[PDB]
Design a protein around this ligand. Sequence first.
Ligand SMILES: [Mg+2]
Ligand SMILES: [Mg+2]
Ligand SMILES: [Mg+2]
Ligand SMILES: [Mg+2]
Ligand SMILES: [Mg+2]
Ligand SMILES: [Mg+2]
Ligand SMILES: [Mg+2]
Ligand SMILES: [Mg+2]
Ligand SMILES: [Mg+2]
Ligand SMILES: [Mg+2]
Ligand SMILES: [Mg+2]
Ligand SMILES: [Mg+2]
Ligand SMILES: [Mg+2]
Ligand SMILES: [Mg+2]
Ligand SMILES: [Mg+2]
Ligand SMILES: [Mg+2]
Ligand SMILES: [Mg+2]
Ligand SMILES: [Mg+2]
Ligand SMILES: [Mg+2]
Ligand SMILES: [Mg+2]
Ligand SMILES: [Mg+2]
Ligand SMILES: [Mg+2]
Ligand SMILES: [Mg+2]
Ligand SMILES: [Mg+2]
Ligand SMILES: [Mg+2]
Ligand SMILES: [Mg+2]
Ligand SMILES: [Mg+2]
Ligand SMILES: [Mg+2]
Ligand SMILES: [Mg+2]
Ligand SMILES: [Mg+2]
Ligand SMILES: [Mg+2]
Ligand SMILES: [Mg+2]
Ligand SMILES: [Mg+2]
Ligand SMILES: [Mg+2]
Ligand SMILES: [Mg+2]
Ligand SMILES: [Mg+2]
Ligand SMILES: [Mg+2]
Ligand SMILES: [Mg+2]
Ligand SMILES: [Mg+2]
Ligand SMILES: [Mg+2]
Ligand SMILES: [Mg+2]
Ligand SMILES: [Mg+2]
Ligand SMILES: [Mg+2]
Ligand SMILES: [Mg+2]
Ligand SMILES: [Mg+2]
Ligand SMILES: [Mg+2]
Ligand SMILES: [Mg+2]
Ligand SMILES: [Mg+2]
Ligand SMILES: [Mg+2]
Ligand SMILES: [Mg+2]
Ligand SMILES: [Mg+2]
Ligand SMILES: [Mg+2]
Ligand SMILES: [Mg+2]
Ligand SMILES: [Mg+2]
Ligand SMILES: [Mg+2]
Ligand SMILES: [Mg+2]
Ligand SMILES: [Mg+2]
Ligand SMILES: [Mg+2]
Ligand SMILES: [Mg+2]
Ligand SMILES: [Mg+2]
Ligand SMILES: [Mg+2]
Ligand SMILES: [Mg+2]
Ligand SMILES: [Mg+2]
Ligand SMILES: [Mg+2]
Ligand SMILES: [Mg+2]
Ligand SMILES: [Mg+2]
Ligand SMILES: [Mg+2]
Ligand SMILES: [Mg+2]
Ligand SMILES: [Mg+2]
Ligand SMILES: [Mg+2]
Ligand SMILES: [Mg+2]
Ligand SMILES: [Mg+2]
Ligand SMILES: [Mg+2]
Ligand SMILES: [Mg+2]
Ligand SMILES: [Mg+2]
Ligand SMILES: [Mg+2]
Ligand SMILES: [Mg+2]
Ligand SMILES: [Mg+2]
Ligand SMILES: [Mg+2]
Ligand SMILES: [Mg+2]
Ligand SMILES: [Mg+2]
Ligand SMILES: [Mg+2]
Ligand SMILES: [Mg+2]
Ligand SMILES: [Mg+2]
Ligand SMILES: [Mg+2]
Ligand SMILES: [Mg+2]
Ligand SMILES: [Mg+2]
Ligand SMILES: [Mg+2]
Ligand SMILES: [Mg+2]
Ligand SMILES: [Mg+2]
Ligand SMILES: [Mg+2]
Ligand SMILES: [Mg+2]
Length: 61
Amino acid sequence: AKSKNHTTHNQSRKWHRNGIKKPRSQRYESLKGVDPKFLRNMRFAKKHNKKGLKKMQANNA
RNA sequence: CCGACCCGUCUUGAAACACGGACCAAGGAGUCUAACACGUGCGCGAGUCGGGGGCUCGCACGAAAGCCGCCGUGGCGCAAUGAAGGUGAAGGCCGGCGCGCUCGCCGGCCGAGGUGGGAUCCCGAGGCCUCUCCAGUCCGCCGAGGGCGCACCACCGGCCCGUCUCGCCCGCCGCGCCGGGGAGGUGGAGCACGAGCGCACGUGUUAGGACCCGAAAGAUGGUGAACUAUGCCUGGGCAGGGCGAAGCCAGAGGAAACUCUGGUGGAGGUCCGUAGCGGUCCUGACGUGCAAAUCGGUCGUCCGACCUGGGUAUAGGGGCGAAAGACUAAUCGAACCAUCUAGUAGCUGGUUCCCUCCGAAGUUUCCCUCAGGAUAGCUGGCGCUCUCGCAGACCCGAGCCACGCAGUUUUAUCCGGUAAAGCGAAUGAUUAGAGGUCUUGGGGCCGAAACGAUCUCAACCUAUUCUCAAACUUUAAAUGGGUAAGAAGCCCGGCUCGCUGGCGUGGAGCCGGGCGUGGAAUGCGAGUGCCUAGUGGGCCACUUUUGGUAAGCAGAACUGGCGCUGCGGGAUGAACCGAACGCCGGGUUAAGGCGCCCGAUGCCGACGCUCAUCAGACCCCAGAAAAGGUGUUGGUUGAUAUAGACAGCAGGACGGUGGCCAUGGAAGUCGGAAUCCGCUAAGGAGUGUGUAACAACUCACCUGCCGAAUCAACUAGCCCUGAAAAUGGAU
RNA sequence: CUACGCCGCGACGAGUAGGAGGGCCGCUGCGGUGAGCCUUGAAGCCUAGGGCGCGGGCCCGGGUGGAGCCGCCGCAGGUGCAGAUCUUGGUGGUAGUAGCAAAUAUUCAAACGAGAACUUUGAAGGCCGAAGUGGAGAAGGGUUCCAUGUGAACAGCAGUUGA
RNA sequence: CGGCGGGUGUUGACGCGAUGUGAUUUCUGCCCAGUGCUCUGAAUGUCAAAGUGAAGAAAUUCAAUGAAGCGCGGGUAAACGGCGGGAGUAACUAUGACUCUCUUAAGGUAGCCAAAUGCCUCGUCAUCUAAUUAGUGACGCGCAUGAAGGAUGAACGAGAUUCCCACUGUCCCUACCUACUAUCCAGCGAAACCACAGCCAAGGGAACGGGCUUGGCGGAAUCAGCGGGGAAAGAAGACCCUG
RNA sequence: CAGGUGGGGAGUUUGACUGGGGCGGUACACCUGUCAAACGGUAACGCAGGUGUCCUAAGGCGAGCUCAGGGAGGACAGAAACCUCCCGUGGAGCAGAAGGGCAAAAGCUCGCUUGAUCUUGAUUUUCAGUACGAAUACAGACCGUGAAAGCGGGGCCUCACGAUCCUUCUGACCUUUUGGGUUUUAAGCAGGAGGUGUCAGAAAAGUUACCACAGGGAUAACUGGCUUGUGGCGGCCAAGCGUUCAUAGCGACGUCGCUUUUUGAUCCUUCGAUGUCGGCUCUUCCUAUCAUUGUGAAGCAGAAUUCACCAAGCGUUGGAUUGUUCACCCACUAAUAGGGAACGUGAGCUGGGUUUAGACCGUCGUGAGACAGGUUAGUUUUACCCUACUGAUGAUGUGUUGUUGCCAUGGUAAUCCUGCUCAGUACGAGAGGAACCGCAGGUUCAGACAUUUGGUGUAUGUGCUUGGCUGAGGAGCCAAUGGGGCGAAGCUACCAUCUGUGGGAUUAUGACUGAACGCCUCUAAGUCAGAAUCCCGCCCAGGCGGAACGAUACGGCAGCGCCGCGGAG
RNA sequence: GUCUACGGCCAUACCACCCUGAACGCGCCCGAUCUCGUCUGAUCUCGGAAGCUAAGCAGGGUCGGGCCUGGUUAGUACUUGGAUGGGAGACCGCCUGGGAAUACCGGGUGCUGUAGGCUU
Ligand SMILES: [Mg+2]
Ligand SMILES: [Mg+2]
Ligand SMILES: [Mg+2]
Ligand SMILES: [Mg+2]
Ligand SMILES: [Mg+2]
Ligand SMILES: [Mg+2]
Ligand SMILES: [Mg+2]
Ligand SMILES: [Mg+2]
Ligand SMILES: [Mg+2]
Ligand SMILES: [Mg+2]
Ligand SMILES: [Mg+2]
Ligand SMILES: [Mg+2]
Ligand SMILES: [Mg+2]
Ligand SMILES: [Mg+2]
Ligand SMILES: [Mg+2]
Ligand SMILES: [Mg+2]
Ligand SMILES: [Mg+2]
Ligand SMILES: [Mg+2]
Ligand SMILES: [Mg+2]
Ligand SMILES: [Mg+2]
Ligand SMILES: [Mg+2]
Ligand SMILES: [Mg+2]
Ligand SMILES: [Mg+2]
Ligand SMILES: [Mg+2]
Ligand SMILES: [Mg+2]
Ligand SMILES: [Mg+2]
Ligand SMILES: [Mg+2]
Ligand SMILES: [Mg+2]
Ligand SMILES: [Mg+2]
Ligand SMILES: [Mg+2]
Ligand SMILES: [Mg+2]
Ligand SMILES: [Mg+2]
Ligand SMILES: [Mg+2]
Ligand SMILES: [Mg+2]
Ligand SMILES: [Mg+2]
Ligand SMILES: [Mg+2]
Ligand SMILES: [Mg+2]
Ligand SMILES: [Mg+2]
Ligand SMILES: [Mg+2]
Ligand SMILES: [Mg+2]
Ligand SMILES: [Mg+2]
Ligand SMILES: [Mg+2]
Ligand SMILES: [Mg+2]
Ligand SMILES: [Mg+2]
Ligand SMILES: [Mg+2]
Ligand SMILES: [Mg+2]
Ligand SMILES: [Mg+2]
Ligand SMILES: [Mg+2]
Ligand SMILES: [Mg+2]
Ligand SMILES: [Mg+2]
Ligand SMILES: [Mg+2]
Ligand SMILES: [Mg+2]
Ligand SMILES: [Mg+2]
Ligand SMILES: [Mg+2]
Ligand SMILES: [Mg+2]
Ligand SMILES: [Mg+2]
Ligand SMILES: [Mg+2]
Ligand SMILES: [Mg+2]
Ligand SMILES: [Mg+2]
Ligand SMILES: [Mg+2]
Ligand SMILES: [Mg+2]
Ligand SMILES: [Mg+2]
Ligand SMILES: [Mg+2]
Ligand SMILES: [Mg+2]
Ligand SMILES: [Mg+2]
Ligand SMILES: [Mg+2]
Ligand SMILES: [Mg+2]
Ligand SMILES: [Mg+2]
Ligand SMILES: [Mg+2]
Ligand SMILES: [Mg+2]
Ligand SMILES: [Mg+2]
Ligand SMILES: [Mg+2]
Ligand SMILES: [Mg+2]
Ligand SMILES: [Mg+2]
Ligand SMILES: [Mg+2]
Ligand SMILES: [Mg+2]
Ligand SMILES: [Mg+2]
Ligand SMILES: [Mg+2]
Ligand SMILES: [Mg+2]
Ligand SMILES: [Mg+2]
Ligand SMILES: [Mg+2]
Ligand SMILES: [Mg+2]
Ligand SMILES: [Mg+2]
Ligand SMILES: [Mg+2]
Ligand SMILES: [Mg+2]
Ligand SMILES: [Mg+2]
Ligand SMILES: [Mg+2]
Ligand SMILES: [Mg+2]
Ligand SMILES: [Mg+2]
Ligand SMILES: [Mg+2]
Ligand SMILES: [Mg+2]
Ligand SMILES: [Mg+2]
């Protein structure tokens, strides 16, 4: 008839058998969820980075 | 001699008083097809595949093999996206031009962009050489740095299709409700120089009998009334007695009506009782029988709704029923036979060789789900991508020592509201006094008279005071949770922006350059993908904890264990304590032990405590409390004592006063108050006995004899009482 | 140095459900191969015989048997049993046990015969007691009827008797 | 299944068919609200198909009309069924003839009762006994009696119950006898059941052991009985739950 | 063809959780506080509650105010009508449950309004990191408000809700409507709504005692096990009762236990079955003792009674009613104590009760049917196995065999009452009224026995007798023992008769001597008496235990014993 | 040494009462034509400058309340980990680390940023 309802017994052991790994912190996070206005201006800046290349290389030289 | 319970199975737990198994032989259970998915092997490869057909002495093999190529039709792949109409995947640089207006017209090139990682490869200053040197010939190794960067990963761009928002151009044999193009978001199982196709094998899932065996049922078509049930037809049968209906005769009495008496007669779903038919009781016999319903005695009925043969009729959701769901061939709340059918089963049982390696879950979410699934988790297998190097042919290193990770600490830095604490702090609960002064508090005795007054009790206020809170809180731990402890960092410059804006502003991105003491300890090699079984009943212990009187009860948290685990110890035992396991020899231990069983104290072990006429004897754990003891042993506090304690033996224990109010005696003692004085050696106007009451005693108080220590109240060790259960018995 | 081989060093070893690997473990059949084995003795079976392997198992000796069988490389399965109140067959203990007890009852002599409680004959004692344990039919059976012979099996003891 | 098919029916209301109750005697009360059944269609409400009209280019849509049935209206309880409460009140108390109200479709009438029907209950009283949860008689606010079934009443009953006389081995309290067994023998000869087996106490353990631990102890092979155990056998529990 | 009727018939369904199921409840979808052990998460049919709504404002913005309460004042006016001042950290209000939050607020009052609108994505919460719901931050429109900064895409926050399929509506001068075109129609694309409350979402009434199957000890009914609330039995304190007097005998308020003979709680074993009540029969055990033996105490004069100790040896009965366990009554008695053993005991019985199928009544139900309501009728199977027990042969060893014995060990048995005398005695005012020794007998039990009495009787012994049969007499027989009278022997009956026993150590208790503790003291050392108890005797059996003693193998080759350490082995 | 405007932290800043205040300032104050609101020029808005520091405000004071910070409470309460420690239990002791809160007793009573004034 009746039976056990809930437990977390042995659950921690199951969790730690393969380790509780943190998320893989990797360079260049995704731009998901960033403000769209800021993102579109960022895209415009990236697009127009091409101009001023001669000035950039002159300064570098 | 030591060890040793019977296997299989379900189970948290099996040696179980849980089930199956008397024994032996033979048979006996994950198969085949189809479809997927992934992995592996093979061939070819932007293709691949003849499987259907055809051609080849038609055929021992050969029903094979070989070949087709204008037999590649076709399948799958090579293009996606949209419901669809439909549409449908190339960009980067140098420029001259409108106005290089965030854009329109062309050239020259190249051909899927860039950032950060990135095995490998390339260059490489400088080193390693011999008998030595000034001087260059050829190549080998190490090498700081630098370069091109595979696959793959993260990110930023770009392109295709759908759909929104904004907006301006372009095209024409149809100037249109025509067609095309742009920018910015967003939806797609896309593109971004293919990876598929065929065959084989393995695993997993599914449909099929589907691992094997197993229902109660449902449907179709037939066979039965030789038993029984009922109707009909035609036959057969039922001793002996009792009662005595109508009708009748005679005699008698009556005016009649009629009545009385004696016979006669022989009716009746009548009575006793054979045969027959039935079947009450013994709850008899028997109960592996004589018998799958019988036998003995006793019984019901026995001229009738009676018993019975044969012939007929009614057939299964039908019959037939004086009705019991009875009977319908030992079968009836729906017969029997065959078939559909190997029906289905989330349920039970079983499931066949060996060794090696790894090794669980009883938990999350959803489900007409709670004995089941899906899902995540836990498991295994297959790998792949990287890191340290692989060193000297024996030998011999010649500040700095890997990508990265962690059930851990340290150093910083946050987070919290439990334990505790608090209530003279809020919110609730709550005890008792104290001090104040207003009132629809009671009132208060002489106040009415202006309670002339002020006495008490209330309420109220004030300062205190006792006790509390899971659903209170000022304060507030321990344990705990997050983050950081660098090269993705720091610092210099420069460029882009349509975002932001006094500003060369802010922010973000991008491009170069320089910094290595690698910026705590300790340990460890990491990252990543695919497929995937079993499980999804748990239980126990320390501690925390809810319900309950409690429970070997029910429910949670943490860790460990049992399940899945043997071994040493606890005599015995799933969980306790120790410790985890290949087969052995030697040494030593753990926990636990060392009188004998039974290895080891057969030590000249140490110090004490304890006598039980129910002693005691080791975690879990297997039995006890309050309360007592002048048993004994310690300890605490206090008291008395040569100005003679204590204990014994012996005296006084009075006067007022036989004190007052209680009275019917209470005179010291049935009760209420107060505790005087003096004699002194002391005496309570009384600790008890008692007398009706007197009286007579005793005590506390003093004294005498006695001559050295003694007394009291507690306290806690062992022991004892408290302490009663059933077969004889358990450190 | 069978490179699918050989050699060295270090650490490690519990295991249900489950997963994987190896098997010079085992069964049956097919393609190859062993110029394999075999009537001078195959398979199978038995064995206080000798051994090998951790093991699954295997080899050899002895006996019995009397005609086929096996190793290796591949291939393919209706391929391995202690259980399923498993299927079929066989066999134990129980156990020379329960039992051969419903309806009164047999005895004597003789014959046949190897053999007599049971057959036959005679004598005796009983029973059914005419609603029979008598004499005849229907249904049903189907040769059981009758004579002779036998003593295998059957007649739950026996039989010289018998459906 | 079907045919103007068939049974009642070779029949015709003193007949067939369908029900209830159950001889005789005496009775069979009230309720048509409910559910049934039935009668009437009265203007009548609703009401399908078909048919009619209209709109439309048609599909189609709309409207008008309006069969049974249902609603509306009567009847019917020997149709199914049903048949109440609360207060006060008589010159001792106690009851309540009587009086108030609320309510129903009607409020259980005649009868009968601790009945085979009454919980409380072993009701109360009487009788039967020494003693009676039994029996009988009586009472009745009766949990929850009651009229096609109530109440009676001879005869009858393998029906249930109580008492009395007689009778007895039912018993006190057992004994003896007879037949057939059992028993022993000759012959013949099964079956059920069977993990292995079979002496106990306690312990622990799936919380009641034949096995294990600790103790008690243990002597071949057997016969006749026996019913304590083997949680004996017989059947995959029929109770309960789940599917 | 259409509508109605249609359990006559057909098919099917008749949720889940659940300290068994049902009834109850919703712990089934949500929300607050707690549990919850200071991150988060965390369960029970845990506790306290709430929800399926409400709101054109209670949404949005802006402005201006301050609330609850209290104190002091003012005509009617009072405890509460309005006006004024002061204090007022919120003690108010914010729709609702609760928690959090809020003061020139988020509250109150005004003014203007519709951001409760049109859109794409991302994210948080539950989470599998799926959905729904809800929510957060943005971005793009169109707006509202304010001077403006700003704020607003519902409600201050934590809840107030819903897939596929289908339907309905709205939008695109949109797509398709199948050879083409036009127009209706239909289909589609996007967004709302109609709902699944079992709230991740079937379309669903009963009954079965006529029942069935697969299972379940995952799960109740009976034993056992844990617990002991309840039941039962005790203890501690002593306010009181007890003519005075707490404790002779009791024990309020409190409090500590024990027991498993009550009833519960739980669900560990058993559902391929452990036969379920009571009675009968029979044995054993316990003591918390009713009687009896030995004692102590009393509010014990005697008698009777009461309390307590050692103590379970022995006994604890006959009946009416009821199925009863319990109960109650009658009567006897020394007493008529309480219990256990699978609520002992069904292959021991019985079957009255409960608890199958038939049937009647009452109540309930429309009905099938139901009822810890009443009533009546209702199959009780097997032992031959092992052990245990009861008896019966035997077995091992002493060379064989016999006689006579011993005793290890086991069993064990006696019990109670009455009458006479003591004795109308002690004691007592009286009423009443014992005891010790002794005597005579009985009860229950045990072991026998048959002289007597009784029973049996198939000596089938002897008469009598019925029916039949042998021709009759005589003699007999048959009738399953024909019937009956008397009856030997044997067996047998409290239905006759006989017999039934002695010590020891001691318990309780009462004492001696005697310290501890110059006194006392039954105790500490040492002593005494002491019983239905205990042990033994008497009695029953006699060990895989012994003793003493007897006889020990031919008339023929045949066996044996002792002496020899005699020999070879 | 102070003030004003705008603030940051938000009581060491608050609350009650008392004392002092030079110069600027801040205020109180005067008035309602205009702007704008009222039952009321009280508030709000506007136009002013006779008087006043009475009040706000600033500074100081109080064996002041509060608040802040210490000591005590106290290595107490509580607590991580350990034992085949004790005890019938309830609970308690020890080892290993951490470690509070009242009452009670002290000290303190705003600091400061930007801009602009006054103070010989
Ligand atoms: Mg579970
Ligand atoms: Mg099983
Ligand atoms: Mg179980
Ligand atoms: Mg087992
Ligand atoms: Mg068991
Ligand atoms: Mg069983
Ligand atoms: Mg089973
Ligand atoms: Mg079996
Ligand atoms: Mg078998
Ligand atoms: Mg086989
Ligand atoms: Mg071919
Ligand atoms: Mg083609
Ligand atoms: Mg790259
Ligand atoms: Mg990209
Ligand atoms: Mg798969
Ligand atoms: Mg099958
Ligand atoms: Mg069906
Ligand atoms: Mg017939
Ligand atoms: Mg008759
Ligand atoms: Mg008759
Ligand atoms: Mg019988
Ligand atoms: Mg019936
Ligand atoms: Mg089947
Ligand atoms: Mg199961
Ligand atoms: Mg909390
Ligand atoms: Mg606390
Ligand atoms: Mg408080
Ligand atoms: Mg538990
Ligand atoms: Mg449980
Ligand atoms: Mg398991
Ligand atoms: Mg494990
Ligand atoms: Mg282990
Ligand atoms: Mg061990
Ligand atoms: Mg032990
Ligand atoms: Mg060793
Ligand atoms: Mg030992
Ligand atoms: Mg030893
Ligand atoms: Mg004791
Ligand atoms: Mg292993
Ligand atoms: Mg097979
Ligand atoms: Mg086999
Ligand atoms: Mg026999
Ligand atoms: Mg016999
Ligand atoms: Mg005769
Ligand atoms: Mg005849
Ligand atoms: Mg013949
Ligand atoms: Mg024979
Ligand atoms: Mg009739
Ligand atoms: Mg009537
Ligand atoms: Mg009509
Ligand atoms: Mg009428
Ligand atoms: Mg009446
Ligand atoms: Mg009545
Ligand atoms: Mg009755
Ligand atoms: Mg009677
Ligand atoms: Mg009566
Ligand atoms: Mg009357
Ligand atoms: Mg035993
Ligand atoms: Mg079953
Ligand atoms: Mg069954
Ligand atoms: Mg039906
Ligand atoms: Mg916590
Ligand atoms: Mg928490
Ligand atoms: Mg405002
Ligand atoms: Mg917006
Ligand atoms: Mg909001
Ligand atoms: Mg749901
Ligand atoms: Mg269970
Ligand atoms: Mg008194
Ligand atoms: Mg049985
Ligand atoms: Mg049994
Ligand atoms: Mg006693
Ligand atoms: Mg019993
Ligand atoms: Mg029995
Ligand atoms: Mg029985
Ligand atoms: Mg009965
Ligand atoms: Mg019945
Ligand atoms: Mg009967
Ligand atoms: Mg026998
Ligand atoms: Mg003896
Ligand atoms: Mg005895
Ligand atoms: Mg005669
Ligand atoms: Mg004669
Ligand atoms: Mg004769
Ligand atoms: Mg006769
Ligand atoms: Mg006689
Ligand atoms: Mg006698
Ligand atoms: Mg003396
Ligand atoms: Mg003594
Ligand atoms: Mg003595
Ligand atoms: Mg102060
Ligand atoms: Mg500590």
